[PDB]
Amino acid sequence: PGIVELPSLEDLKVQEVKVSSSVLKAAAHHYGAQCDKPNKEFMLCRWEEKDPRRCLEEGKLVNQCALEFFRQIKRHCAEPFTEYWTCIDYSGLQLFRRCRKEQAQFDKCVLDKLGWVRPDLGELSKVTKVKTDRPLPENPYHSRARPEPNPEVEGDLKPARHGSRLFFWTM
Amino acid sequence: DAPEKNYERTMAILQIESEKAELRLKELEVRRLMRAKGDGPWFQYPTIDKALIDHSPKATPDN
Numbered sequence A: 001p002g003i004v005e006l007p008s009l010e011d012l013k014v015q016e017v018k019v020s021s022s023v024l025k026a027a028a029h030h031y032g033a034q035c036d037k038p039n040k041e042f043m044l045c046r047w048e049e050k051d052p053r054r055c056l057e058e059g060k061l062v063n064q065c066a067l068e069f070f071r072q073i074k075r076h077c078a079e080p081f082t083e084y085w086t087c088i089d090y091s092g093l094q095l096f097r098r099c100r101k102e103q104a105q106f107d108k109c110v111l112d113k114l115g116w117v118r119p120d121l122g123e124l125s126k127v128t129k130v131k132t133d134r135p136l137p138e139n140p141y142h143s144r145a146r147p148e149p150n151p152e153v154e155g156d157l158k159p160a161r162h163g164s165r166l167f168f169w170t171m
Numbered sequence B: 001d002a003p004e005k006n007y008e009r010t011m012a013i014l015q016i017e018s019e020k021a022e023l024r025l026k027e028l029e030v031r032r033l034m035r036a037k038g039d040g041p042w043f044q045y046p047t048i049d050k051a052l053i054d055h056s057p058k059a060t061p062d063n
C-alpha cells in the first residue's frame, strides 16, 4: 500500500505543561471552567476527524490555553494553590475529600483575586455545543464506494407456469 | 375419438411439454448463473446486518 504520512518533529514541538498530575488534579475544576472553549474545540475535532494528525493545531491551542491558566494562578494565588496541590499530592488515591480546607482557601483566594466560580457537582460532565469554522469531515473513515445492492422484487406474483414442472406433475 | 380430436389434442400436449422443457433448461441456466455470480435473489447467503452497528460517540476517538 501507500506511505503513511506523519508530521515532522518540528511540527510537534510546543511548550508543554510541565507540571505533575496532582498539580493538574488540584486545578482541574477551574481548568474545566476557564479553559472550556479550546478544549472542547479540540475534543470535537478529535472525535470528528478520528485522526490526531488533523488535530495538532487545535491541540496546540489547548497547550496554549492551559499554560495561561497556570500563569494567572502563578501571578496571583501561587501559595494557596501550592499548599493545596501539596496536600492533594500527599495522598495515594489523591482524595479531594482529605483536603477540603486548602480547597476552601484556594477557592476563596481565586474567587476574590480572579473571579472564577468553581463548577458544581454535575456541571463538567455536560455535553456542550461548540461553534467552529472548520468544515465537517465528509468521510472521516476514508471509506470508498459501497457496492451496488441486488435488485429487489417487483411486479404482481403470477402463478407458476404449468405448475411445478417436476418430471410429470402437471400441477 | 376423431383423428382431428387426437391430432389437435396432441398439438396441445406438445405445446405444453415443449414449453415446460424450455423452462426447465432456462431454470438450470438461471441457477448456474446465480450460483456463479451471486447477483440474483437466490443463493443469498446471510451476512452481518449493519443495523447492529453502534454509531454513537465511543470512549476513545480513534475509531
Ligand SMILES: CCCCCCCCCCCCCCCCCC(=O)OC[C@H](COP(=O)([O-])OC[C@H](O)COP(=O)([O-])OC[C@H](COC(=O)CCCCCCCCCCCCCCCCC)OC(=O)CCCCCCCCCCCCCCCCC)OC(=O)CCCCCCCCCCCCCCCCC
Residues within 6 Å of the ligand: A168, A169, A170, A171
Ligand atoms: C361446482 C364446483 C364443484 C365441482 C366438482 C367436480 C369434481 C367432483 C370430484 C372432485 C374430487 C376429485 C376426484 C378426482 C379428480 C381427478 C383426479 C385424477 O383422476 O387424476 C388423474 C391423474 C392424471 O391423469 P391425466 O390423464 O393426466 O389427467 C386427468 C385429470 O384431468 C387430472 O387433472 P389434474 O391435471 O388437475 O390433476 C393434477 C395432478 C395430475 O397428475 C399428475 O400430474 C401425474 C402424477 C400423479 C401422481 C403420480 C405418482 C406416481 C407414483 C405413486 C403411485 C402410487 C400408486 C398408484 C395407485 C395405487 C392405488 C392406491 O394430480 C395430482 O397431482 C394428484 C395426484 C393423484 C391423485 C388424484 C386424485 C385421487 C383422489 C382419490 C384418491 C383415491 C386413490 C388414488 C390412487 C392413489 C395414488 C394417487 O391420473 C394419475 O395420476 C393416475 C392415477 C389415477 C388417479 C386417481 C383416480 C381418482 C378416482 C379413484 C376412484 C377409485 C378409488 C378406488 C379405491 C382407492 C384405490 C385403492
